[PDB]
Design an enzyme around this catalytic site. Structure first.
Site, PDB file in Angstrom:
ATOM      1  N   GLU A   1       0.825  -1.205   0.000  1.00  0.00           N
ATOM      2  CA  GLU A   1       0.000   0.000   0.000  1.00  0.00           C
ATOM      3  C   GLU A   1       0.863   1.261   0.000  1.00  0.00           C
ATOM      4  O   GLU A   1       0.580   2.218  -0.719  1.00  0.00           O
ATOM      5  CB  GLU A   1      -0.913   0.037   1.232  1.00  0.00           C
ATOM      6  CG  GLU A   1      -2.119  -0.901   1.191  1.00  0.00           C
ATOM      7  CD  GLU A   1      -3.154  -0.495   0.153  1.00  0.00           C
ATOM      8  OE1 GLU A   1      -3.054   0.624  -0.390  1.00  0.00           O
ATOM      9  OE2 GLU A   1      -4.075  -1.295  -0.115  1.00  0.00           O
TER      10      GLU A   1
ATOM     11  N   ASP B   1     -12.304   9.695  -7.674  1.00  0.00           N
ATOM     12  CA  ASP B   1     -13.483  10.325  -7.080  1.00  0.00           C
ATOM     13  C   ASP B   1     -13.169  11.597  -6.287  1.00  0.00           C
ATOM     14  O   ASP B   1     -14.071  12.229  -5.736  1.00  0.00           O
ATOM     15  CB  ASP B   1     -14.211   9.322  -6.182  1.00  0.00           C
ATOM     16  CG  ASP B   1     -13.490   9.076  -4.870  1.00  0.00           C
ATOM     17  OD1 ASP B   1     -12.247   9.178  -4.840  1.00  0.00           O
ATOM     18  OD2 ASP B   1     -14.169   8.770  -3.870  1.00  0.00           O
TER      19      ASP B   1
ATOM     20  N   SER C   1     -11.186  11.704  -3.596  1.00  0.00           N
ATOM     21  CA  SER C   1     -10.722  11.383  -2.254  1.00  0.00           C
ATOM     22  C   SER C   1      -9.222  11.097  -2.302  1.00  0.00           C
ATOM     23  O   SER C   1      -8.643  10.962  -3.378  1.00  0.00           O
ATOM     24  CB  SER C   1     -11.473  10.168  -1.695  1.00  0.00           C
ATOM     25  OG  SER C   1     -11.216   9.001  -2.458  1.00  0.00           O
TER      26      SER C   1
ATOM     27  N   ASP D   1     -15.347  -3.466  10.217  1.00  0.00           N
ATOM     28  CA  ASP D   1     -16.493  -2.946   9.476  1.00  0.00           C
ATOM     29  C   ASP D   1     -17.387  -4.012   8.845  1.00  0.00           C
ATOM     30  O   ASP D   1     -18.520  -3.724   8.461  1.00  0.00           O
ATOM     31  CB  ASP D   1     -16.011  -1.992   8.381  1.00  0.00           C
ATOM     32  CG  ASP D   1     -17.118  -1.107   7.849  1.00  0.00           C
ATOM     33  OD1 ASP D   1     -16.918  -0.471   6.791  1.00  0.00           O
ATOM     34  OD2 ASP D   1     -18.186  -1.037   8.494  1.00  0.00           O
TER      35      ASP D   1
END
Ligand code: CL
Ligand code: NA
Length: 129
Positions: free
Chosen positions: A35, A48, A50, A101
């Site tokens: 990552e 988008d 973000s 989540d």
């Protein structure tokens, strides 16, 4: 800060990530590697609008506030800049909320495509933990 492989493993373990929600330490180190390449200052903009921040590339659409992602949520109640610190506490605490989540580590695309189903234990081998 750019973490060493074992250095990060030790830090994550100390913060309670080993076996957190059933995910062994190797999973978290593998996710961090792909990552951000272990760089706490990594940032990447998405189509988008973000932005992803830090060692675990947490997205501003739902988890942190960066003041420039319209109609987004700040579920971790933290400024995104806090996720770029040399101290990984903020990133770890937020990651714990993310992985709980419901979709587990699948929330991290790099983990799904490059760690999931592989020998993740290899990421902590040779480390003094
Ligand atoms: Cl799960
Ligand atoms: Na946000």
């Amino acid at each position: 800060k750019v973490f060493g492989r074992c250095e990060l493993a030790a830090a994550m373990k100390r913060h309670g990530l080993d076996n957190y929600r059933g995910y062994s330490l190797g999973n978290w180190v593998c996710a961090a590697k792909f990552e951000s390449n272990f760089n706490t200052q990594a940032t990447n903009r998405n189509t988008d609008g973000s932005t992803d921040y830090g060692i675990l590339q947490i997205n501003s659409r739902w988890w942190c506030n960066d003041g420039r992602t319209p109609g987004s949520r700040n579920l971790c109640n933290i400024p995104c800049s806090a996720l770029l610190s040399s101290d990984i506490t903020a990133s770890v605490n937020c990651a714990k909320k993310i992985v709980s989540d419901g979709n587990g580590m699948n929330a991290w695309v790099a983990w799904r495509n490059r760690c999931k189903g592989t020998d993740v234990q290899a990421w902590i081998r040779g480390c003094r933990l």
